Design a protein around this ligand. Sequence first.
Ligand SMILES: CCCCCCCCO[C@@H]1O[C@H](CO)[C@@H](O)[C@H](O)[C@H]1O
Ligand SMILES: CCCCCCCCO[C@@H]1O[C@H](CO)[C@@H](O)[C@H](O)[C@H]1O
Ligand SMILES: CCCCCCCCO[C@@H]1O[C@H](CO)[C@@H](O)[C@H](O)[C@H]1O
Ligand SMILES: CCCCCCCCO[C@@H]1O[C@H](CO)[C@@H](O)[C@H](O)[C@H]1O
Length: 494
Amino acid sequence: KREHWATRLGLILAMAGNAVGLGNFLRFPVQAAENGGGAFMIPYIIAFLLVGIPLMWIEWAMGRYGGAQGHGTTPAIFYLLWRNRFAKILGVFGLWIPLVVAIYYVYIESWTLGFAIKFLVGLVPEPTDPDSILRPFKEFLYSYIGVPKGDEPILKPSLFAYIVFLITMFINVSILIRGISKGIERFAKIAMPTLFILAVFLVIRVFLLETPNGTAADGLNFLWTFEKLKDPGVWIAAVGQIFFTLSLGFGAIITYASYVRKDQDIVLSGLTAATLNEKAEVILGGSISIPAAVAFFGVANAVAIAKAGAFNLGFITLPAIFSQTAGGTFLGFLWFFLLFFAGLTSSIAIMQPMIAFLEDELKLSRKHAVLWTAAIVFFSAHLVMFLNKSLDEMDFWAGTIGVVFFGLTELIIFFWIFGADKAWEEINRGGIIKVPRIYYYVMRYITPAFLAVLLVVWAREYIPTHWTVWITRFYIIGLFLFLTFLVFLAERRR
Ligand SMILES: CCCCCCCCO[C@@H]1O[C@H](CO)[C@@H](O)[C@H](O)[C@H]1O
Ligand SMILES: CCCCCCCCO[C@@H]1O[C@H](CO)[C@@H](O)[C@H](O)[C@H]1O
Ligand SMILES: CCCCCCCCO[C@@H]1O[C@H](CO)[C@@H](O)[C@H](O)[C@H]1O
Ligand SMILES: CCCCCCCCO[C@@H]1O[C@H](CO)[C@@H](O)[C@H](O)[C@H]1O
């Protein structure tokens, strides 16, 4: 009937693996560094317990419920929880958001593969002061991406970058066309321990760094210790970070859970996978980028450096640091290959909702479903590769506002429209362990308030222009119109 996860471990590794690629290998330190160290940890762990842990369980319960019904996509599951025609249109978001993200994320996943190859081969620029070293790497990334000089709205991507984009798309297709058990699960069971050893090695190797300008021990000292706690800005930063910590709102959790059998546990399994992301992110992610950045530029600059961006830190600053340390070019290969494997576990997960839609609703073969999903993602990506602000616009609508708005939609449908006490049964059913019943009050009231707070602060910021962003808006609007036509074509089949 429906493909199911062969192993309980592989299910956890695959579920843990999708949030691994969502930046947090380098993303947590930047968001920390902006908020400082032990400042960030208190709202962030609190947000992890208050928002991520409940909302994750909400996503698991919705997906498995749909799997028994035979649907792993949001438009159908929303209709099962809420028998209303507006629910299917809202469901298109949970199909729209991962698709738009996939369009721009797989291309970023190519950059790690292309760099790793160039670092492996040694085709890397090699040069006291920060500006002397960072410029040859800024140009190296910019030549690769094809970023134009200054303002110009057209990118000239490298042929090498384009050839790698074909290879990158192909590798996903290879993993996806095999299915859940022989594709994602086999790869997750391979990729996740590969990431552990790579991170642990890098963490140990980063730990030994020391320069006349600073010491990597001070970078760790930075990460662990008001009045930032009193400043409302930090609570905003941590909650949005939890979404990427656990891949909430992207709809990836809902789809993977649909392949869980009707009576298998989600409580212990989801908590475990949620814990794996935390340990990887707090320990392995925190002890690489910032401690290395602090060791070379001093404690003060890395904070200012991290404010510039994660790409500057991840794709320019960190590779420049490795070039100066002893061996050296090899570390750059590891760091980017580490990012590439993490991207694979996520890119295969972020394209799964679209694939499951074609199989479940349009009754396409998985071979056809994967290839038509790959074609949509590959074709649309040309918009991201050649338009200057296109990547940023999609990431703002799908990756930022959308994931928060969609998570808030999940709670209201599953815990309010569906019936909270009805839903509490679905979370804990077949659970090896079962949720503490304090969360019933948190899932019902405390968690939705926080998601509501997050949306209004951004609306306060963004309720009040380059032309190229309108093309990107116009395009993703059509995608939503297109996916609505597919929900319409599928609802008229029966
Ligand atoms: C393989 C992919 C590498 C992971 C890099 C993604 C880390 C995300 O990076 C962050 O994305 C935010 C957008 O919401 C930006 O506002 C931030 O400047 C940036 O730090
Ligand atoms: C097989 C997928 C469609 C192929 C047609 C895409 C045409 C764009 O391919 C272009 O080739 C140029 C060669 O120098 C590169 O400079 C460009 O960056 C690249 O986008
Ligand atoms: C990169 C940070 C995430 C690392 C995920 C590593 C997942 C651990 O890996 C798993 O651990 C189990 C024991 O706990 C073993 O039984 C499994 O063989 C192994 O796959
Ligand atoms: C642009 C994406 C289109 C997908 C490529 C489909 C190629 C033709 O698909 C065909 O469908 C048949 C029915 O299962 C199979 O028996 C054939 O092996 C296959 O070649």
